[PDB]
Design an enzyme around this catalytic site. Structure first.
Site, PDB file in Angstrom:
ATOM      1  N   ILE A 121       0.845  -1.182   0.000  1.00 50.44           N
ATOM      2  CA  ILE A 121       0.000   0.000   0.000  1.00 50.44           C
ATOM      3  C   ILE A 121       0.887   1.241   0.000  1.00 50.44           C
ATOM      4  O   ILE A 121       1.508   1.573   1.007  1.00 50.44           O
ATOM      5  CB  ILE A 121      -0.963  -0.008   1.189  1.00 50.44           C
ATOM      6  CG1 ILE A 121      -1.799  -1.294   1.189  1.00 50.44           C
ATOM      7  CG2 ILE A 121      -1.882   1.212   1.103  1.00 50.44           C
ATOM      8  CD1 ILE A 121      -2.847  -1.333   2.301  1.00 50.44           C
ATOM      9  N   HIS A 122       0.961   1.895  -1.154  1.00 48.77           N
ATOM     10  CA  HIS A 122       1.836   3.051  -1.319  1.00 48.77           C
ATOM     11  C   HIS A 122       1.177   4.116  -2.191  1.00 48.77           C
ATOM     12  O   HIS A 122       0.457   3.802  -3.133  1.00 48.77           O
ATOM     13  CB  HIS A 122       3.174   2.621  -1.943  1.00 48.77           C
ATOM     14  CG  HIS A 122       3.035   1.995  -3.297  1.00 48.77           C
ATOM     15  ND1 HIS A 122       3.192   2.708  -4.469  1.00 48.77           N
ATOM     16  CD2 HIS A 122       2.720   0.732  -3.667  1.00 48.77           C
ATOM     17  CE1 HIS A 122       3.010   1.900  -5.500  1.00 48.77           C
ATOM     18  NE2 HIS A 122       2.713   0.697  -5.040  1.00 48.77           N
TER      19      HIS A 122
END
Length: 167
Positions: A16-17
């Site tokens: 998750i970026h």
């Protein structure tokens, strides 16, 4: 029914970026994000980072491989829609070998290393990795493609082999 209904599966070594998962989850309104990774499962610092980085209104849960297989195996009257997120191909292979049914596998992020061939800005793959993806397709009939975000270029596995690993 199985505890989880798998609505999508994605491999991205940065998990998750940025806004990436916010974009992806818009296509799966009722789903939660399930990250399956043995390293993250014990890493409280990064579990907090990824939970905080999650799209507004989207739950994030983290499981190790064995725990994910155990959870999915449970029967329930109300299934939970889940978007599976893996850090790497090997962890995905382990869960599929353990019987978890994945129908579509999106290769989202794999960093370049000397052992990998560059394919896109977001994805590089070794010959061994491509062989593994082909094996998942053959054994499990998974539709495998590279795609960074929902509106960016989609390259199917067969095209990857033809252009980047002629063999």
């Amino acid at each position: 029914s199985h505890m989880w209904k798998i609505v999508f599966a994605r491999i991205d070594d940065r998990l998750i970026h940025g806004q990436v998962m916010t974009r992806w989850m818009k296509g799966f309104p009722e789903a939660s994000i399930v990250i399956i990774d043995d390293e993250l499962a014990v890493d409280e610092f990064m579990k907090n980072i990824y939970t905080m980085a999650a799209p507004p209104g989207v739950k994030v849960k983290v499981f190790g491989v064995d725990a994910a297989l155990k959870e999915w195996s449970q029967k329930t009257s109300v299934e939970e829609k889940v978007f599976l997120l893996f850090k790497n191909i090997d962890t995905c292979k382990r869960v599929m070998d353990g019987g978890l049914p994945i129908t579509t596998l999106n290769i989202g992020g794999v960093a370049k290393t000397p052992q990998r061939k560059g394919i896109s800005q977001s994805v590089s793959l070794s010959e061994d990795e491509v062989k593994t993806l082909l094996e998942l397709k053959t054994k499990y009939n998974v539709d495998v493609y590279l795609q960074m975000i929902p509106d960016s270029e989609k390259i199917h596995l067969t095209t990857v082999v033809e252009k980047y690993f002629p063999e």
